[PDB]
């Protein structure tokens, strides 16, 4: 749909849409930029992630509100709560499928540096995780496996190629721990991963500048916040 707009104009409009809190527009601009076929820079990857995180975040919040109402209802409330929850769920699944499709065509296969490849594989794990949040039954099993596989490949690369304080490595470990706790019914694995990630980052903080220290410690605090809730 964005095929007639210059790549650089799509990126500039994505930045404007972020400032205007127009995240659906932002995601459409960034989809158009990806579909130009060139690799994305560090900041362009961040724009892609912010746009879709906000779109799917609104959908997830709405799905949770509707699911809670539906669970309460089961007086006959009619089919409306279920029908509307299903509508939101289908829309959410479509956004996740769109993001996964961008990663598969062709962002991951062209990503050779650790920073880009880990970033995209973490996104792949995240969007399969959002699919898993709404999935049921055997569908849930294969979706869960797909999230786990993406996160595991990202973890393997990050441990070989990035320092333990790298913010992408830290955020990957945070989100994989949430996967273990909330999706995979593995709270002990979640706690172990968060603890080991925190401790290994702590021991590497001495190597960092003031600005990098702030970036890494911010994410470490999120690991600690989860550990406080889980223990």
């Amino acid at each position: 749909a964005m095929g007639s707009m210059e790549r650089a104009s799509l990126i500039q409009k994505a930045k404007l849409a972020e400032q205007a809190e127009r995240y659906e527009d932002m995601a459409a601009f960034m989809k158009g930029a990806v579909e130009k076929g060139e690799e994305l820079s560090c900041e362009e990857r961040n724009l892609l992630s912010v746009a879709y995180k906000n779109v799917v975040g609104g959908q997830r919040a709405a799905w949770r509100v509707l699911s809670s109402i539906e669970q309460k209802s089961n007086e006959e409330k009619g089919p409306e709560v279920r029908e509307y929850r299903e509508k939101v769920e289908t829309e959410l699944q479509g956004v996740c499928d769109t993001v996964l499709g961008l990663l598969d065509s062709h962002l991951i296969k062209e990503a050779g540096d650790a920073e880009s490849r880990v970033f995209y594989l973490k996104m792949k794990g995240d969007y399969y995780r959002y699919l898993a949040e709404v999935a049921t039954g055997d569908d849930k099993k294969r979706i869960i496996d797909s999230a786990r596989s993406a996160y595991q490949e990202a973890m393997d690369i990050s441990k070989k190629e990035m320092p333990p304080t790298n913010p992408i490595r830290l955020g990957l470990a945070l989100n994989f721990s949430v996967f273990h706790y909330e999706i995979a019914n593995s709270p002990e694995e979640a706690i172990s991963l968060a603890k080991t990630t925190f401790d290994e980052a702590m021991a590497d903080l001495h190597t960092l500048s003031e600005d990098s220290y702030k970036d890494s410690t911010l994410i470490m605090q999120l690991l600690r916040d989860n550990l406080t809730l889980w223990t």
């Binding site: 906000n54 999120l222 916040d225």
Partner: peptide, 9 residues
């Protein structure tokens, strides 16, 4: 609990 949040703007 909490995953990485989006940055604010």
């Amino acid at each position: 609990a909490g995953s990485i949040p989006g940055r604010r703007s």
